[PDB]
Amino acid sequence: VKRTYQPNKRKHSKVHGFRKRMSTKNGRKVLARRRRKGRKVLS
Amino acid sequence: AVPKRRTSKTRKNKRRTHFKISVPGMTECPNCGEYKLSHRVCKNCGSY
Amino acid sequence: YRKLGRTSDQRKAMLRDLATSLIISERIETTEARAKEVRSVVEKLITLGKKGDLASRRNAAKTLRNVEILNEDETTQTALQKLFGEIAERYTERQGGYTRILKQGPRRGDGAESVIIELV
Amino acid sequence: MEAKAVARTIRIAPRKVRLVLDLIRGKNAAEAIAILKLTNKASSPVIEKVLMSALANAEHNYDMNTDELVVKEAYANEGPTLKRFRPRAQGRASAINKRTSHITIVVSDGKE
RNA sequence: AUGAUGAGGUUAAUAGGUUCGAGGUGGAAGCAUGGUGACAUGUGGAGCUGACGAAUACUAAUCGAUCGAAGACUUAAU
RNA sequence: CGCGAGCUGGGUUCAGAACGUCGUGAGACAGUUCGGUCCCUAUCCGUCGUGGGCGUAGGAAAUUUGAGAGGAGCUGUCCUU
RNA sequence: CAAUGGUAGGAGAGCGUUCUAAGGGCGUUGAAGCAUGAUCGUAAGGACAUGUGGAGCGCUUAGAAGUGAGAAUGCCGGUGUGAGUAGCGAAAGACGGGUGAGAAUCCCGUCCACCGAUUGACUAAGGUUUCCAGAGGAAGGCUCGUCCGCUCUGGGUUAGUC
RNA sequence: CCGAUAGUGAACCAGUACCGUGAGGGAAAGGUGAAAAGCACCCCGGAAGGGGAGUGAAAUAGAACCUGAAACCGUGUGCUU
RNA sequence: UUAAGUUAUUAAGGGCGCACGGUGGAUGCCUUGGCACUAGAAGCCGAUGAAGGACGUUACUAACGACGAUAUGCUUUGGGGA
Ligand SMILES: CC[C@H]1OC(=O)[C@H](C)[C@@H](OC(=O)NCCCOCCC#Cc2ccc3c(=O)c(C(=O)O)cn(C)c3c2)[C@H](C)[C@@H](O[C@@H]2O[C@H](C)C[C@H](N(C)C)[C@H]2O)[C@](C)(OC)C[C@@H](C)C(=O)[C@H](C)[C@H]2NC(=O)O[C@@]21C
Ligand SMILES: [Mg+2]
């Protein structure tokens, strides 16, 4: 059966990805929290 | 269809009283003196 | 008789193939049940060979596979020709037997009693 | 008077080896070897190996003879188990314990 | 089901094969004749035939090994 | 109202729908109607068969009596008198 | 001389664990833990001896508390039982030769069988090194394994026109 | 005040394994010895292991390495059935 | 010898004690790290390109620090003493 997450590099990097989070202030937030947390993969 | 209770060590060891391997049907080989299975060809020599 | 844990078409085929291979090699290694069941087939083929008339040749052609043996000096001849020219003579005077069986110990991968069925 | 030989962390479940070690307990060395080499089980090659190690140890370290050698006692006990899983149905996973065995054999000349 | 039960292990018919037969099928192959051919007829109830009946050691039950008694006291007849 | 870890699932008792009735309404009625997922590898006792051990004052091969136990246990028509 | 069953519950006396203050002590001539024992007190519990153990720890008085577990379908970690039971995930294999400590399972060969609007050839998306040649066998392969999409070593992707 | 189920989630390549499309969520895991003196050689084995010899105070301190409880699994047996 | 009566032995296995092993990681002892504070600095870094990172850099080679084509670092003063 068709399950979820039919992977796609372009959409993955479009809906997510550094420049997309840097396009909205709320996007800028999640990077802020992820650095405060010391995350290694930020977007 | 599930065990209503534990099988104690006593019951366990009791059930497996008859669960054992038998010593092989081995006889001495007439050409080499090493043991072989009866009615089989000796694997050390290769006789009868 | 035995079924050998196998269907009818797959057994018919296995028995005839095993008989052919025995005829090629004159002694092979296999499990007890299949030796016990190829014994009769190979013995009956040799009987078809002890007559050599064209009817028995044509009739024994049913079972044997078509194989080629390279003898010494690069001489070539098929299973039928072997049966009717090199094995009919050997057992012209013997009135049975034609095969022996030598039990061997169990194999490793299973507990199957391997045996060697050989043309006597 | 006694010779030791041990195989540790053998990849066979101890209760599977113990069946075979329930035959060579207290028998002579030659008869014991003939049993192992002819018993058609999985653990048998790994135990025969231990018997040869024990007899070699006896000859090379104590210079006792390998004919009057009875098997004083031979046993097997659990080892460091390896834990694995099998993907079963409806997303559930069941466990598989790949066990091991610490096989011990001591052969004696039956004296002091 | 396995184990048991039963028929046998060479001083042997227990099973296989070989030979003969029962039963089943129904006129094998190769020939010769006739037909343009599709086919038909004689050989020849032929040929084939798993379990069914009998004979025959031709092949396998060759070699070997384990277990298994020596008989309690008491009293009465003896 | 024996028996669904032996079976079915037609009725009834989920969500869909529809008619009659009641309710302004959401909805409702033991009023109808069409449709609607029956899971479980048996541990113990129990039961039906089938083995091994031991005891029956020696070790054995065969034939056994029967303390008990179980199974059967039904009945029609015709003729004769 | 009288009293002493007891649940919700009230009252009193206490036993134990960690730490602190002081005093006094014990310790490689073997501390704490751990194990055993047939020892002592009315109880919570306290000693002693012998083994393992290889450095800290008792006793008196008094202070403080993360102070006492058997149950919460408690949480975490180990190990059972069911049991050598269920399962071994659609299918055709047989045999000769070789390799090895070991082979139904690896390599070669013959025969046989399955697909064949496809289990065949391409190419996208996606995965990223699984690709190739040597070597290995712990682990992963639902068995075995000398084998591999596994492990170790060294390699491999070449565009003016796609 | 805690001494590795505590004390930070994290004493140790930790906001990391891993999980999720993502926001996010999130672990487990310290201790050989004084010194590495980390076991020269020999023996069985293809190897893993082992058994001697040697190092060391100690090697049931041998690298999964201080102490090593209980559940649990074995091997003997004195007394029972 | 025959009767009549009585009683062992047995242990396929099991029970209880005892001894010796295994797994397992509790306990005791230990501290690499935490926690809560007191006193004294400090309490703005960036178009002079910041905070964070990515790719690199060693004799060999991945990781972690460190440092960036002058890359496991370069110049200088003062200490610095194998
Ligand atoms: C395949 C394995 C899974 O088994 C099952 O599905 C079986 C089939 C199921 O049998 C039954 O249906 N009844 C027997 C059939 C009776 O029909 C009469 C007509 C009807 C009806 C009805 C009524 C209301 C609702 C409802 O209101 C509603 C909603 O959503 O609101 C949803 N519908 C569908 C309803 C339908 C099990 C066994 C079921 O138990 C039984 O239910 C009864 C309520 C009580 C039974 N007793 C206590 C008297 C009980 O024995 C359960 C509840 O499953 C649904 C089992 C539970 C434990 C599970 O959840 C397991 C994990 C299952 N889930 C799964 O994945 O594995 C299963 C094993
Ligand atoms: Mg799934």
Written as six digits, the tokens of B30 are: 């007439």
Which residues are paired to B8 by β-bridges?
none
Give the count of beta carbons closer than 10 Å to the beta carbon of residue D68.
12
* CATH number of the domain to which A40 belongs: 1.10.287.3980
Alpha-carbon distance A24 to C102, whole Å? 85
Alpha-carbon distance D83 to D15, whole Å? 17
Tokens 């048998």 label which residue? Answer: D44
Q: Domains in chain C: how many in total?
A: 1
Q: How many CB pairs (< 8 A) connect B and C?
A: 11
Q: Is residue D76 a contact partner of residue D19, using CB atoms and an 8 Å limit?
A: no
Q: Domains in chain A: how many in total?
A: 1
Q: Is residue C103 a contact partner of residue C32, using CB atoms and an 8 Å limit?
A: yes
Which residues are paired to C102 by β-bridges?
C116
Q: Solved by what technique?
A: cryo-EM
Nucleic strand F under 7 Å from the C-beta of B20: no
Closest CA to D44 of D21, D26, D25, D71: D21
Q: What's phi and psi for C60, nearest 5 deg?
A: -75, -20
Residue C100, domain extent = 1-120
Instruction: Categorise residue A5: left if φ over 0, alpha if ψ from -120 to 50, beta otherwise.
Output: left
DSSP per residue over A1-43, as a string? ---S----HHHHHHHSSHHHHTTSHHHHHHHHHHHHTT-S---
Model resolution, angstroms:
2.5
Residues near B41 by Cβ (< 8 Å), separated by ≥ 6?
B47, B48, C102, C103, C104, C116
DSSP per residue over C26-87, as a string? SEEEEEHHHHHHHHHHHHHHHHHHHH--HHHHHHHTTTS---EEE-GGG-EEEHHHHIIIII
Contacts 24+ apart (CB under 8 A), A17-24: A17/A43, A18/A42, A18/A43
b/e code C34-58 from CB counts within 10 Å (16+ = b): bbbbbbebbbebbebbbeeeeebbe
Q: How many residues does chain B have?
A: 48
Residue D105, domain extent = 2-110
Q: Domains in chain B: how many in total?
A: 1
DSSP B18: G
Return the sign of the alpha-carbon dihedral for residues D8, D11, D16, D17: negative
Alpha-carbon distance C77 to C74, whole Å? 10
Q: Which amino acid is at C98?
A: Y
Alpha-carbon distance B16 to B25, whole Å? 23
Q: How many residues does chain A have?
A: 43
Cross-chain residue pair D39–B20, CB shorter than 8 Å: no
Contacts 24+ apart (CB under 8 A), C94-102: C96/C43, C98/C42, C98/C43, C98/C46, C99/C39, C99/C42, C99/C43, C101/C35, C101/C36, C101/C39, C102/B41
Q: Which of C29, C103, C115, C118 to mutate against chain B (most B CBs within 10 Å)?
A: C103
Give the count of beta carbons closer than 10 Å to the beta carbon of residue C112.
15
Give the count of beta carbons closer than 10 Å to the beta carbon of residue D72.
18
Q: Is residue C118 a contact partner of residue C91, using CB atoms and an 8 Å limit?
A: no
Alpha-carbon distance C47 to D35, whole Å? 43
Nucleic strand F under 7 Å from the C-beta of B23: no
* CATH number of the domain to which C118 belongs: 3.90.1030.10
**Residue B15: which nucleotide is closest by CA–C1'?**
I13
Alpha-carbon distance D42 to D17, whole Å? 8
* CATH number of the domain to which D79 belongs: 3.90.470.10
Alpha-carbon distance D22 to D47, whole Å? 12
Q: Is residue D52 a contact partner of residue D79, using CB atoms and an 8 Å limit?
A: no
Alpha-carbon distance C87 to C62, whole Å? 18
Query: How near does any CA of chain B get to the CA of D38, in Å?
Result: 7
Half-sphere exposure of D112 (CA within 13 A, CB side): 0
**D5 CA to middle of ligand 2, Å?**
48
Q: Is residue C98 a contact partner of residue C120, using CB atoms and an 8 Å limit?
A: yes
